[PDB]
Amino acid sequence: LKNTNFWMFGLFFFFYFFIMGAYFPFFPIWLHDINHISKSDTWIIFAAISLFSLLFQPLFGLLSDKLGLRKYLLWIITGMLVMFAPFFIFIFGPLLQYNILVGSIVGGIYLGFCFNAGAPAVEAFIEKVSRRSNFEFGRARMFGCVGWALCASIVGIMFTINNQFVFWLGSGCALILAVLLFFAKTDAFSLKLALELFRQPKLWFLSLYVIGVSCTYDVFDQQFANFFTSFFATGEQGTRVFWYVTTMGELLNASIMFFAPLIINRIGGKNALLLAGTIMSVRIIGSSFATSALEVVILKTLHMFEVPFLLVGCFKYITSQFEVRFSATIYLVCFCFFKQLAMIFMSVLAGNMYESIGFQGAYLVLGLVALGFTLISVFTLSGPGPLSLLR
Amino acid sequence: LKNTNFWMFGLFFFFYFFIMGAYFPFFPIWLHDINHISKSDTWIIFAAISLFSLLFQPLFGLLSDKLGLRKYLLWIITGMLVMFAPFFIFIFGPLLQYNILVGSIVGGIYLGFCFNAGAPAVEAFIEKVSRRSNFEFGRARMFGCVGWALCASIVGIMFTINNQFVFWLGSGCALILAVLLFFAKTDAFSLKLALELFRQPKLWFLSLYVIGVSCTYDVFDQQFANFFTSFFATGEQGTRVFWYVTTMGELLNASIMFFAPLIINRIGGKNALLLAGTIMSVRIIGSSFATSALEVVILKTLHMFEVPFLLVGCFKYITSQFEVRFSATIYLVCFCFFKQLAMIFMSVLAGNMYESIGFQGAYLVLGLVALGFTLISVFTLSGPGPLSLLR
Numbered sequence: 094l095k096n097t098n099f100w101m102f103g104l105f106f107f108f109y110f111f112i113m114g115a116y117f118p119f120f121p122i123w124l125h126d127i128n129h130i131s132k133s134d135t136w137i138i139f140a141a142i143s144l145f146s147l148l149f150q151p152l153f154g155l156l157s158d159k160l161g162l163r164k165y166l167l168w169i170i171t172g173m174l175v176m177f178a179p180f181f182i183f184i185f186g187p188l189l190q191y192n193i194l195v196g197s198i199v200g201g202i203y204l205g206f207c208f209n210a211g212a213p214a215v216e217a218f219i220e221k222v223s224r225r226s227n228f229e230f231g232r233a234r235m236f237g238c239v240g241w242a243l244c245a246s247i248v249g250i251m252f253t254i255n256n257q258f259v260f261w262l263g264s265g266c267a268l269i270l271a272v273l274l275f276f277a278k279t280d281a282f283s284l285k286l287a288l289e290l291f292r293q294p295k296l297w298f299l300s301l302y303v304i305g306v307s308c309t310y311d312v313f314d315q316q317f318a319n320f321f322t323s324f325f326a327t328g329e330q331g332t333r334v335f336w337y338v339t340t341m342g343e344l345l346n347a348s349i350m351f352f353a354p355l356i357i358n359r360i361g362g363k364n365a366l367l368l369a370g371t372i373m374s375v376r377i378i379g380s381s382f383a384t385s386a387l388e389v390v391i392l393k394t395l396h397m398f399e400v401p402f403l404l405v406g407c408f409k410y411i412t413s414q415f416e417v418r419f420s421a422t423i424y425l426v427c428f429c430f431f432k433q434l435a436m437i438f439m440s441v442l443a444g445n446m447y448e449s450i451g452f453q454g455a456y457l458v459l460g461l462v463a464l465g466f467t468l469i470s471v472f473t474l475s476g477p478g479p480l481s482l483l484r
Numbered sequence: 485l486k487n488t489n490f491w492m493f494g495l496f497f498f499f500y501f502f503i504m505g506a507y508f509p510f511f512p513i514w515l516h517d518i519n520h521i522s523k524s525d526t527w528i529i530f531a532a533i534s535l536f537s538l539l540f541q542p543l544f545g546l547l548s549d550k551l552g553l554r555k556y557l558l559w560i561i562t563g564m565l566v567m568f569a570p571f572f573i574f575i576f577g578p579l580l581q582y583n584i585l586v587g588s589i590v591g592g593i594y595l596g597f598c599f600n601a602g603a604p605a606v607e608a609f610i611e612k613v614s615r616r617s618n619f620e621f622g623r624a625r626m627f628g629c630v631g632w633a634l635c636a637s638i639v640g641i642m643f644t645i646n647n648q649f650v651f652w653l654g655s656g657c658a659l660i661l662a663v664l665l666f667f668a669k670t671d672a673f674s675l676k677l678a679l680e681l682f683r684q685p686k687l688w689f690l691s692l693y694v695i696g697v698s699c700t701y702d703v704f705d706q707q708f709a710n711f712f713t714s715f716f717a718t719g720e721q722g723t724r725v726f727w728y729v730t731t732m733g734e735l736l737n738a739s740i741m742f743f744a745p746l747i748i749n750r751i752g753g754k755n756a757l758l759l760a761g762t763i764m765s766v767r768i769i770g771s772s773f774a775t776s777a778l779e780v781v782i783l784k785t786l787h788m789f790e791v792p793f794l795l796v797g798c799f800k801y802i803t804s805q806f807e808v809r810f811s812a813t814i815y816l817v818c819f820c821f822f823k824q825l826a827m828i829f830m831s832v833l834a835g836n837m838y839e840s841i842g843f844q845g846a847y848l849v850l851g852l853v854a855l856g857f858t859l860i861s862v863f864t865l866s867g868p869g870p871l872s873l874l875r
């Protein structure tokens with residue numbers, strides 16, 4: 094598309110998710126393998142990342158709307174992202190081993206800021222441009238997936254050689270990413286209107302949909318990779334093919350997000366979320382009837398259909414219900430602060446189901462919670478209906 | 485020259501001094517004008533950087549030699565330089581004003597680690613390559629002067645537009661540093677053996693050569709720019725002229741160090757330090773008898789004549805006389821550390837001299853101490869003398 098901002102931010106995503114692609118997928122490996130962390134102390138790291146994300150995420154909602162279309166906040170995010178290289182290497186890496194992990198655990202608030210709490214803020218910002226310009230959020234964020242793809246592809250291949258090469262590659266993306274932010278050309282509320290949203294029922298109705306459907310789905314994605322390798326005689330060959338799927342599968346997200354933002358506009362965007370929660374729910378429940386390798390793989394791919402219909406359709410439902418001047422705040426509260434607060438308790442009772450009643454015996458329960466609240470939310474979520482599509 | 489490592493480390497200097505030159509000479513301007521900081525609480529920053537530099541430079545001397553050609557410590561340096569842009573922009577800048585200086589002066593210890601106690605670590609390291617690869621240390625180091633010039637030229641130009649741009653551009657060079665480092669192929673003792681150095685008479689002689697001439701010369705450049713601007717019809721316009729000298733003077737300084745090692749090698753280096761000290765000495769006295777503005781411009785440039793004969797001669801003297809197995813240590817212990825330790829002591833009475841008598845009235849006492857020790861060092865520093873030059 095001729096619009097310049099499209100081609101600017103389209104690349105901003107590509108890089109920001111590239112630099113996150115060397116962080117999120119391979120973290121448990123980077124722990125248990127590279128830095129040698131006991132799986133009984135690995136949870137300690139995540140205990141902080143999902144804690145400092147409870148203060149940063151609500152707080153960014155405020156700045157995202159009090160600043161509006163001002164780049165000011167992104168400068169600090171993209172700034173810290175430059176420290177990405179020496180973080181993992183010289184700081185974060187030996188700080189877990191050398192002194193108390195705690196010194197690194199609360200020293201690992203950085204990556205909460207930049208990624209866990211940064212990424213949602215980045216998308217929340219970029220949606221605002223999409224309404225000021227012509228293009229849709231979907232084809233913009235499309236690149237973020239293929240950006241995310243490339244990193245995971247360049248890790249595994251440079252892993253046997255010099256795995257560190259990727260981290261420096263990341264901090265270089267931060268600069269080229271900050272370059273874009275400069276060439277980007279663009280162009281309020283009071284806190285009393287925050288408390289009013291807690292009064293609004295239709296705020297709670299969405300938090301239900303997230304807690305029930307998305308928080309339950311995120312705890313599910315945790316030990317799915319280990320579960321995946323269990324359908325192979327050799328635990329290695331599963332770990333391999335697991336990597337092969339995640340790579341190609343993002344080219345699908347780019348393929349799905351191609352026409353995704355056009356499909357939602359007819360369907361409404363409430364019914365987009367229903368459709369997401371459904372795909373989530375089918376995938377998870379299908380893990381309970383899957384016995385073979387050929388079966389379990391298809392399921393990992395169901396995630397690639399689901400994501401486009403969630404995050405695109407999310408903002409559609411947001412802006413098509415609440416004022417656009419609050420579109421950023423509630424996205425970093427409902428789909429984050431609350432999703433995080435619930436994932437605390439659901440990642441716990443998950444572990445107490447796996448080791449208790451087993452994998453599939455738990456994936457059934459969670460699968461029912463997914464579906465349960467997916468279907469609850471056909472009556473709960475304010476907007477059109479699935480029945481309105483049928484008409 | 486077909487020498488591989490020469491061009492690598494030659495450029496390596498170019499970029500590392502591009503990133504220093506864009507901070508060190510502009511530092512006080514970056515304080516008083518940009519951050520709007522007073523003139524009395526300037527000497528809380530420089531009275532902390534120096535403190536931590538005193539306790540790093542020793543620590544750096546030993547671990548520079550325990551590594552030898554192992555690139556380890558030089559990696560930590562280049563790694564932490566990647567955090568350069570986030571530092572001055574979003575950390576060192578805003579944080580200092582936010583909380584008590586003390587709380588944010590400790591933030592300025594990083595600034596010691598990478599430049600004050602970092603640059604000399606980069607010199608010692610490459611000096612050790614100067615013999616394993618066939619090239620002279622001086623002809624590589626001249627790249628630092630042109631690099632130092634290029635940034636500083638970019639500094640003043642960009643200050644009118646966006647003074648931030650130089651910092652970001654710096655953290656870009658920290659990456660290409662890592663690159664050049666990877667294409668460098670380069671392949672013991674104990675601290676008990678280091679202690680013995682201090683009981684060597686030969687060590688005291690060079691140690692005194694520093695405290696006397698070198699320390700007295702590095703304090704001379706403190707408020708010299710204040711003394712320089714008075715020789716103009718305008719201070720503001722006389723600042724622009726100082727910018728031409730500081731830049732072009734380095735272009736000359738390269739050319740001087742182009743031929744330096746070729747000369748220093750046959751003279752011995754012992755007589756090059758007496759020479760360097762005489763170049764310094766001639767420059768100090770000139771300020772006390774500065775009856776014109778054209779004079780003080782040449783004196784500014786007389787510094788550029790001195791630089792090579794020192795840096796080239798420090799190693800060419802250390803390596804010649806002292807054993808190579810302590811080359812980096814004694815360079816960081818005798819020159820950097822002791823000078824710094826001694827400079828903190830000379831900077832006090834200096835202020836109690838300017839306000840006791842004046843600028844031109846104080847410089848005479850320094851020049852006596854300067855040349856005094858320059859001539860004393862003729863009968864202490866073991867080696868040849870200016871006496872052998874005539875033969």
Ligand SMILES: OC[C@H]1O[C@@H](S[C@@H]2O[C@H](CO)[C@H](O)[C@H](O)[C@H]2O)[C@H](O)[C@@H](O)[C@H]1O
Nearest residue numbers: 110208209212213237238241346400404
């Ligand atoms: O911190 C989690 C964030 O996850 C992303 S979604 C993420 O997108 C990549 C490619 O960009 C892949 O599809 C992953 O499978 C998918 O999880 C959200 O956009 C953020 O809001 C956070 O939820």
Ligand SMILES: OC[C@H]1O[C@@H](S[C@@H]2O[C@H](CO)[C@H](O)[C@H](O)[C@H]2O)[C@H](O)[C@@H](O)[C@H]1O
Nearest residue numbers: 501599600603604628629632734737791
């Ligand atoms: O922190 C001060 C450091 O200064 C350099 S010397 C520096 O070199 C540049 C070009 O590389 C210019 O000539 C400047 O005039 C000159 O001061 C030292 O080599 C380091 O050890 C530090 O002392």
